[PDB]
Structure formats: structure tokens, C-alpha cells
Design a protein around this ligand. Structure first.
Ligand SMILES: C[C@@H](O)[C@@H](C(=O)O)[C@H]1C[C@H](SCCNC=N)C(C(=O)O)=N1
Ligand SMILES: C[C@@H](O)[C@@H](C(=O)O)[C@H]1C[C@H](SCCNC=N)C(C(=O)O)=N1
Ligand SMILES: [Cl-]
Length: 244
């Protein structure tokens, strides 16, 4: 581990949007990491919907989710996010960060197996204190941007302690963007229930000959700025010549 190079010039991308945050990048081929803020890079927050990555893996490996086509019917309760008020499969539940679908996963996984799996994953502080169906939103689990990278690297290489199939399905469900230059597999998150409210974007960029892992979070006082998670990350990615 060569350490983490700090590149403060990326702060310009946050300041441009009156925002504060961190982007962490990991060059897989060179085993080199870069961040604008070495301190915040290692600060552990609630994972919020980025927890849908480990939650999906566990649900799949325990057969709570059979495959990416299985339909989880809307419970008929109207919630404030319109896309949640419909039937979902794993693909669309990830895409739209459909919390109630994953809360039901968590309840079926159960506290004991959830704890053991997060320890097996070496995920964050491995603490699931709180409600079994909400701890990643308002309980004890905390993970930093650099810890997200470590976890994502295991998933990329199929090294997590679940089946290869489970890891392949989750990486399929993380698909976010692709073109002839790059593929982004990622997961957003918006931690709102405990201060400070922060937005997440974690994942990686696949190139022909390299993979660049990333994890960012940023202060997010309102949902108004949620698009800045991807916008700021892409500005860093383009400055670093990762995407055109
Ligand atoms: C061809 C078969 O062997 C193959 C299949 O699905 O048909 C099995 C082999 C491993 S088993 C789970 C990981 N092993 C852990 N010790 C695997 C998987 O990890 O998805 N599937
Ligand atoms: C509030 C939490 O449930 C939060 C999370 O679990 O991380 C939800 C809300 C937004 S998706 C809809 C956008 N929300 C407000 N505009 C979000 C995400 O950005 O991933 N997941
Ligand atoms: Cl894919």
C-alpha cells in the first residue's frame, strides 16, 4: 500500500457548487489511491442506500432474492418517492433505491446472519446496532469512502464470502452508465436521518485495460443537490483523464 496521494485541486469542483465533500479514486492496475481530502476520505458515515450493495449480496446468497427478475410487489403504502410506489425487481429496486424492498430483505435475512455477513465482508465498522430493517439509515453501521473502495474491490474480483453468482448479479444490478469508452457500476445514497445529511456515490469505472474504483460523499442539506454527486465525480474523473 503506497498510501493515498492528496490532490487538493479537486476541491475546486466542490467549491464551484457551494459544496463540501470528498472523492476517493483507486487505480487498480497501479494500486494507487488519490483523494482531495485525506481526512474526510477516512471519515465513516451511515452508508444509506450504498448499503444496498452488501444487502443485495446477502439476500441473494441466502435465497431471500431468487434472481434479478423476481418481483417484489408494492405493499400498497404510498411513500414520498413516487418510484417506490410500484412493483420492483432487484434491478429497478437498486436503480431507484427502493428502501422498503430492502427493509423486507433485511427482516428476512435477520440480525444474526446480517451481522455475520458484514463481518465476513469486513464492511465498515461491522456494527448493525439499531433496527434490523433500518440500521444502515439510522443505526450504528459506519463506513468511510476508503472502506467502500476496499469492499468494492473485493466485489469486483468476486472475493467476497458469497457465491460468484451472487456477486455477478449484484454487479449487473449496479450497472449505471455505459458507452464505447467506459462502464460505470455504482450505487447512490442519501443519508438523511442523522446529521450531517450527506450524499454518496460509490462504484467503479471499467476501461479496456484498467478499473478505477471511486467513492465520494458530500454534504447534502437538501435533495436539490443530489445530481452533484455524479456531476462532481465526473469532473474528477475527467480531470484525471479516466473518462473523456
Ligand atoms: C459449476 C458449479 O460448480 C457452479 C454452478 O453454479 O453450477 C458453482 C460453483 C461455485 S459454489 C459457491 C462458492 N464456493 C464457495 N466455497 C459457484 C458460485 O460461486 O456461484 N457455482
Ligand atoms: C432517504 C433515503 O431512503 C435514501 C437512501 O436510502 O440512501 C434514498 C433516497 C434517494 S432516491 C430519491 C431521491 N430522494 C429525494 N429526492 C436515495 C439515493 O440517492 O440513493 N436513496
Ligand atoms: Cl452488465
Amino acid at each position: 500500500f503506497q498510501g493515498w496521494q492528496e490532490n487538493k485541486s479537486w476541491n475546486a469542483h466542490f467549491t464551484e457548487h457551494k459544496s463540501q465533500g470528498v472523492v476517493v479514486l483507486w487505480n487498480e492496475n497501479k494500486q494507487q489511491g488519490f483523494t482531495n481530502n485525506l481526512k474526510r476520505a477516512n471519515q465513516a458515515f451511515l452508508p444509506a442506500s450504498t448499503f444496498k450493495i452488501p444487502n443485495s449480496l446477502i439476500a441473494l446468497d441466502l435465497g431471500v432474492v431468487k434472481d434479478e427478475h423476481q418481483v417484489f410487489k408494492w405493499d400498497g403504502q404510498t411513500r414520498d418517492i413516487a418510484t417506490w410506489n410500484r412493483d420492483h425487481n432487484l434491478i429497478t429496486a437498486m436503480k431507484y433505491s427502493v428502501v422498503p424492498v430492502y427493509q423486507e430483505f433485511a427482516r428476512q435475512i435477520g440480525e444474526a446472519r446480517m451481522s455475520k455477513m458484514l463481518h465476513a465482508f469486513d464492511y465498515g465498522n461491522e456494527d448493525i446496532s439499531g433496527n434490523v430493517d433500518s440500521f444502515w439509515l439510522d443505526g450504528g453501521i459506519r463506513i468511510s469512502a476508503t472502506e467502500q473502495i476496499s469492499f468494492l474491490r473485493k466485489l469486483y474480483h468476486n472475493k467476497l464470502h458469497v457465491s460468484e453468482r451472487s456477486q455477478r448479479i449484484v454487479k449487473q444490478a449496479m450497472l449505471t452508465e455505459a458507452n464505447g469508452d467506459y462502464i460505470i457500476r455504482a450505487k447512490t445514497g442519501y443519508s438523511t436521518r442523522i446529521e450531517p445529511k450527506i450524499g454518496w456515490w460509490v462504484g467503479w469505472v471499467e476501461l479496456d485495460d484498467n478499473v478505477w474504483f471511486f467513492a465520494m460523499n458530500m454534504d447534502m442539506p437538501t435533495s436539490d443537490g443530489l445530481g452533484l454527486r455524479q456531476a462532481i465525480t465526473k469532473e474528477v474523473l475527467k480531470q484525471e483523464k479516466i473518462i473523456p
